[PDB]
Design a binder for this molecule. Structure first.
Ligand SMILES: Nc1ncnc2c1ncn2[C@@H]1O[C@H](COP(=O)(O)OP(=O)(O)OP(=O)(O)O)[C@@H](O)[C@H]1O
Ligand SMILES: [Mg+2]
Ligand SMILES: [Mg+2]
Ligand SMILES: [Mg+2]
Lengths: 753, 297, 207
């Protein structure tokens, strides 16, 4: 039996859930979905329909005698059971007449149970839409029949131009991601409804693919006996899966540690290059293992998790792939870039957490990845590295390397291709991976950011051309792969954008944000009872889609003068006008706090630099500020830092987000509303106020007296009440007052902008 | 053993690859190049090279000391195998330097990851903004990355079995500087030999784990055995040759990839003085000898 | 073989070197001066003194008539001639702090200037931070006595450079009244080795 039939049937196993709660027929969801897939002629080979119709115990039992063994729907049934976890496994099936099914419930947020040991449990849900990102709301909300009817008609539109083929699995997954992302996989209370249909179906398809490959390797042709005839205890015990850990190292040095004059333009190009490098490597290994995109549990942030089959063929392919990747990386980036490939053997009981140590999977996978990164190169790659050393009079302008140079220009080949693609990196461009291109890719491929029209005349007649796009319209036809990454660029010039603001200091703003303790949330944030691969995937997808897609959309909402370099996962690097960056920092904090409903906190560092400041030092300094914000600990009695802070332009100005917003911004607003009618002597008076406030520490009495005198001089164009307010602030909240005053001076500086 | 304590009274520039960045320490090849340049200046480069190659003088690379607390880069240990609780290598990632005496606490856990970081406070980095003034053209700006040490803070180098020649070169190296823009106002230090007995206890002890304390490269006949249960990190060493009588033009030396000075090994190796310049008038050497601190793992 | 040239730089009219284009410095003044990274005290960078001294010496040694006497003191790496250096400059910290606090005064000041338009007679003010006159900077310059026959000429040129500095400025808006400096307590002492002609070098420096 075909593996593609099993993959498609496992992806479309719960088609009948949306079908059933979209129409009015009152039948089992498996039957309704089987009929719906039967309505399409290309989706009719009885294997698709067997997987869709019979993936529950009662339905399988009703037909197991008539159906033959190794019939591919035992795999789908067991994959659904494994992906569910400690949730319902063998009970009544949706659409049956033994229960009253509520076809109108919304899916809960995965953050309802996240970190509930210290932040509590709550009941949020996603309101239905029709991008844009859907935020969770505490108000109880319902899904009308019209919502699922529109979903059904869009799915009918997409499925007409789809086939159960290898090249249409990505299109099927894109349909599912677009449509089922906000529908519950289970409309049953007394449980968590936070798992989407897309995440559940993707996990089921990945598990089914791995189980099928394992069975073919193990020479098992008795799926009934081995899975359903008993409770599959022996199968649940055996290690049938591999959890793999693509891990890229040295991205910070590769991207930001550059020194060209035009080094600000290439930051986005380098970030895009590394992101698409990781995506292409994962896709290449998947197609080498004859697996679908569904087996990528998570990709992004220089990291990829793949669910594989614990087979000898898979391990041999992994060894060959790792050797080829290591050789390619050493050839191009001697030691500056590295990808670590580790895997661990896991069983269905580990995935379902029945044995109690689902987290040991990732524990030992991280242990293996660290062990592999500790001993990267063998004692022949080091020898080759030292032997291929040459005395050179030339070196790269920004990459400062003496190899792979261009004969007419002191720049590296990667260093020139990145500048080229940065010139061709604009809005609404798609990415083509072919034998010819600009950026070098592993396995004898090259990548270009060429436009849509000149991509159509590249795949309509060619062999093995891969198209990657940020946005996919008409999901079925024009087969592409959707890649998500924060890439909002208000203006790529970085110079006219600065000479677009009229009031303020001519300074660039660098924002670097990072979620506090995301790894801890992935380890123990989810309660042990609600631990499953589907819930883990839902949380991962929530975080990744937030960062990439929602940062793009939020920055596009109002024309922020920001030039996002990287969003990816858990991190953020954006450069723009410092006032826009400062304004968007609080917006970012508030939007993240809404999206997570205050279950995770974010730390940021905001740097202020001139245009010609070195980009390597911008990155390093803003990273130091972000580390200082992560070091925030108001009391030296607690354990572990509070970490919910922001650093303003210097490691001494670390304030918590609440402190920043409330104190500093209300003080800045009052200062702005009371200082706009000061004379040019008043500006010097504010400068003297700042100097006196800074010196107060070493001058208790004389300096506070001088401050009182300065306020007396000022309280003719600002009023006596605000002079007294400033005096009270100076004796009570001084560092916040100094921060607000410095921000006001920099914002109102009349030295161009 | 004979800790060379460096007290800097000016900001330093130790470049990794760029003039706009500075690192807080300098490597053992940097110190060896500085001492070899001093020896060439006073005319006994061959004696110093023979001393270094015959292991008469062998030194680690510079490490921070903060108020008689000698620090060591956080060793890359194969531990964290405590797979039940704690945060091994989780909060031990922003921790770059561990005290040399508190290394047994770090080995078995119990070292406070947070407290070891704010306690470690040596100076702070800065960027010096400069120009090349042109009388009629447009002045071209450039900037230098610098690090300024604190009052009771500096760098120290482990030297075992000090030599009169090493002490004589160290005295001359006081008045030439160390680091990048030393002919500008950046290389300036005072040194002491300062024999220590607490540190000698650590280095007289044996163990199953060898912490590499200087950037080293095992010879080809021993690299294979060095790479056996090793937990290392590979670092590129290179740059331009700094001499007056080499090639009549600025030329980069060959890139040498050595083991970073926090690596841990189970098999001991002794590196080599590698010649990374061969097409010029004089040899150019890259000190890659192994300095080891043994612990129990 | 290594000589230490000591001395003191005394500010006469207020001195403004450099731009500390970081948030801390620019948040308190329009155009800050270079401060120490940790103590925040004003300093004279070794590069500023070295460059101004080399500029004046190169002017004076040519006078419309670089050369070897400049390249051997300050170094060269242009295309084929590479002399390393003989003078090793150091960042000069502010030595007058306890003396300046007896005057109840800060080490730095803000000078209020303006420019008046000539077409419209409209003025426009500007503020520059400046190190107050009377500030003292003790400096050490290290000399590498590579040649025994050229040390006297090198020290004659060093004294000429100091003298040219004394009739010039050191940093910033000099022609508008800033940066005038004086040199006092100029001496040279041998730090490494033995040099019997150190007395004539002191005579050159004490001239
Ligand atoms: N394409 C990219 N562009 C910009 N930043 C990225 C990109 N990919 C990943 N990052 C971020 O760079 C950060 C650090 O990555 P890096 O691999 O250099 O250090 P690391 O996480 O400590 O891994 P390792 O220990 O192997 O060096 C990560 O937080 C990551 O999110
Ligand atoms: Mg990584
Ligand atoms: Mg984080
Ligand atoms: Mg991160």
């Amino acid at each position: 039996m075909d593996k593609i039939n099993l993959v498609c049937g496992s992806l479309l196993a719960d088609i009948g859930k949306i079908i059933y709660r979209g129409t009015s027929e009152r039948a089992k969801h498996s039957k309704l979905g089987g009929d719906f897939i039967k309505s399409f002629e290309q989706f009719r080979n009885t294997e698709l329909t067997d997987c869709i119709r019979y993936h529950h115990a009662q339905e399988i039992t009703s037909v197991k005698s008539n159906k033959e063994k190794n019939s591919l729907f035992y795999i789908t049934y067991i994959a659904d059971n494994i992906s569910s976890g400690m949730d319902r496994r063998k009970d009544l099936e949706e659409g049956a007449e033994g229960f009253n099914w509520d076809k109108k419930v919304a899916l809960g947020s995965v953050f309802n149970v996240l970190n509930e040991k210290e932040k509590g449990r709550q009941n949020y849900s996603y309101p239905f839409v029709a991008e844009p990102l859907n935020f969770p709301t505490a108000t109880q909300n319902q899904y009308t029949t019209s919502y699922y009817d529109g979903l059904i008609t869009d799915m009918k539109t997409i499925l007409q131009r789809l086939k159960p083929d290898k090249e249409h699995i990505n299109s099927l997954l894109q349909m599912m991601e677009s449509l089922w992302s906000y529908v519950p996989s289970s409309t049953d209370k007394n449980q968590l409804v936070d798992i989407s249909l897309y995440d559940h179906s993707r996990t089921t398809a990945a598990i089914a693919s791995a189980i099928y490959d394992y069975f073919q390797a193990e020479n098992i042709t008795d799926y009934q006996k081995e899975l359903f005839d008993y409770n599959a205890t022996e199968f649940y015990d055996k290690n049938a899966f591999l959890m793999m850990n693509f891990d890229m190292s040295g991205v910070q040095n590769f991207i930001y540690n550059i020194s060209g004059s035009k080094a600000l333009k290439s930051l986005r190009a380098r970030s895009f290059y590394l992101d698409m490098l990781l995506e292409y490597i994962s896709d290449n290994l998947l197609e080498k293992l004859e697996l679908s995109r569904a087996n990528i549990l998570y990709v992004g942030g220089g990291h990829a998790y793949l669910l594989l089959a614990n087979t000898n063929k898979t391990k041999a392919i992994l060894s060959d792939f790792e050797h080829d990747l290591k050789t390619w990386f050493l050839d191009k980036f001697k030691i500056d870039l590295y990808v670590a490939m580790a895997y661990t053997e896991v069983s269905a009981n580990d995935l379902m957490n029945h044995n109690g140590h689902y987290r040991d999977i990732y524990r030992r996978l991280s242990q293996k990845t660290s062990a592999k990164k500790a001993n990267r190169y063998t004692a022949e790659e080091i020898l080759n590295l030292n032997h291929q050393g040459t005395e050179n009079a030339r070196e790269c302008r920004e990459c400062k390397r003496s190899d792979l140079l261009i004969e007419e220009d002191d720049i590296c080949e990667i260093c020139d291709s990145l500048q080229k693609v940065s010139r061709d990196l604009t809005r609404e461009n798609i990415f083509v991976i072919a034998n010819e291109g600009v950026l070098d890719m592993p396995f004898g491929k090259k990548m270009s950011a060429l436009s849509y029209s000149q991509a159509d005349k590249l795949k309509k007649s060619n062999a093995e051309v891969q198209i990657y796009a940020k946005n996919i319209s008409e999901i079925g036809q024009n087969l592409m792969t959707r890649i998500d990454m924060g890439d909002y660029t208000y203006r790529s010039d970085f110079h006219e954008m600065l000479e677009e603001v009229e009031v303020g200091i001519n300074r660039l703003g660098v924002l670097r944000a990072d979620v506090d303790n995301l790894g801890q949330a992935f380890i123990n944030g989810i309660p042990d009872d609600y631990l499953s691969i589907s819930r883990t995937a839902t949380f991962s997808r929530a975080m990744s889609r937030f960062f990439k897609n929602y940062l793009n959309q939020l920055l596009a909402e109002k024309s922020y003068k920001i030039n996002v370099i990287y969003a990816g996962g858990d991190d953020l690097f954006m450069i723009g006008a410092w006032q826009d960056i400062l304004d968007f920092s609080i917006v970012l904090k508030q939007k993240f706090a809404d999206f997570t409903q205050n279950k995770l906190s974010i730390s940021a560092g905001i740097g202020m630099f001139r245009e010609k400041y070195p980009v390597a030092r911008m990155a390093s300094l803003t990273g130091d500020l972000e580390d200082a914000a992560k070091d925030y600990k108001p009391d030296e009695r607690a354990v572990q830092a509070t970490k919910n802070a922001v650093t303003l332009f210097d490691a001494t100005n670390v304030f918590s987000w609440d402190t920043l917003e409330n104190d500093i911004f209300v003080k800045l607003d009052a200062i702005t509303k009371n200082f706009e009618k000061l004379d040019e002597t008043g500006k010097a008076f504010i400068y003297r106020l700042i100097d006196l406030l800074r010196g107060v520490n070493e001058n208790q009495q004389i300096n506070i007296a001088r401050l009182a005198y300065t306020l007396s001089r000022m309280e003719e164009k600002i009023g006596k009440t605000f002079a007294q307010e400033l005096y009270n602030w100076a004796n009570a909240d001084r560092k916040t007052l100094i921060m607000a005053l410095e921000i006001y001076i920099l914002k109102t500086r009349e030295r161009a902008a | 053993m004979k800790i060379i304590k460096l007290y800097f009274e000016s900001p330093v520039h130790f470049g990794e690859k760029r003039l706009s960045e500075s690192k807080i320490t300098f490597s053992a090849d940097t110190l060896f190049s500085a001492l070899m340049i001093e020896a060439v200046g006073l005319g006994k480069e061959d004696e110093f090279y023979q001393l270094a190659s015959n292991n008469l003088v062998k030194f680690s690379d510079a490490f921070p000391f903060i108020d008689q607390y000698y620090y060591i880069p956080k060793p890359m240990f194969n531990l964290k195998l405590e797979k039940e609780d704690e945060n091994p290598s989780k909060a031990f990632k922003k921790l770059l330097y561990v005290p040399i005496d508190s290394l047994e606490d770090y080995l078995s856990g119990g070292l406070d990851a947070y407290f070891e970081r704010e306690s470690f406070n040596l100076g702070k980095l800065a960027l010096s903004e400069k120009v090349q003034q042109h009388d009629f053209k447009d002045s071209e700006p450039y900037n230098v990355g610098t690090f300024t040490f604190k009052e009771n803070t500096g760098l120290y180098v482990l030297i075992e079995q000090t030599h009169p020649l090493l002490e004589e070169l160290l005295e001359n190296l006081q008045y030439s500087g160390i680091g990048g823009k030393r002919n500008s106002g950046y290389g300036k230090f005072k040194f002491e030999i300062l024999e220590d007995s607490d540190i000698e206890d650590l280095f007289s002890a044996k163990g199953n784990r060898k912490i590499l304390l200087s950037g080293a490269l095992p010879k080809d006949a021993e690299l294979e055995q060095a790479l056996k249960n090793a937990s290392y990190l590979l670092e590129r060493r290179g740059g331009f040759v700094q001499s007056d009588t080499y090639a009549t033009n600025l030329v980069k030396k060959q890139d040498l990839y050595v083991f970073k000075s926090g690596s841990t090994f189970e098999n001991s190796f002794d590196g080599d003085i590698y010649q990374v310049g061969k097409k010029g008038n004089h040899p150019v050497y890259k000190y890659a000898k192994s300095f080891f601190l043994e612990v129990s793992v | 073989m290594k000589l230490v040239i000591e001395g003191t730089i005394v500010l006469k009219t207020g001195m403004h070197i450099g731009g500390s284009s970081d948030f801390s410095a620019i948040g308190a003044v329009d155009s800050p001066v270079v401060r120490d990274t940790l103590t925040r005290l004003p300093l004279i960078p070794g590069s500023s003194l070295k460059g101004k001294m080399r500029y004046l010496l190169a002017k004076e040694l040519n006078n419309g008539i670089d050369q070897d006497e400049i390249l051997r003191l300050f170094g060269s790496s242009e295309k084929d001639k590479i002399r390393r250096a003989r003078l090793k400059f150091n960042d000069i910290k502010l030595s007058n702090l306890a003396e300046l606090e007896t005057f109840n005064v800060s080490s730095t000041e803000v000078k209020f200037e303006n420019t008046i338009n000539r077409k419209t007679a409209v003025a426009n003010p500007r503020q520059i931070e400046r190190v107050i006159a009377g500030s003292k900077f003790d400096f050490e310059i290290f000399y590498n006595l590579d040649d025994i026959k050229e040390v006297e000429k090198d020290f004659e040129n060093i004294k000429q450079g100091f003298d040219l500095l004394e009739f010039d400025y050191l940093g910033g808006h000099g022609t508008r009244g800033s940066g005038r400096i004086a040199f006092e307590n100029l001496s040279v002492i041998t730090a490494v080795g033995n040099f019997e002609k150190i007395n004539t070098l002191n005579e050159i420096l004490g001239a």
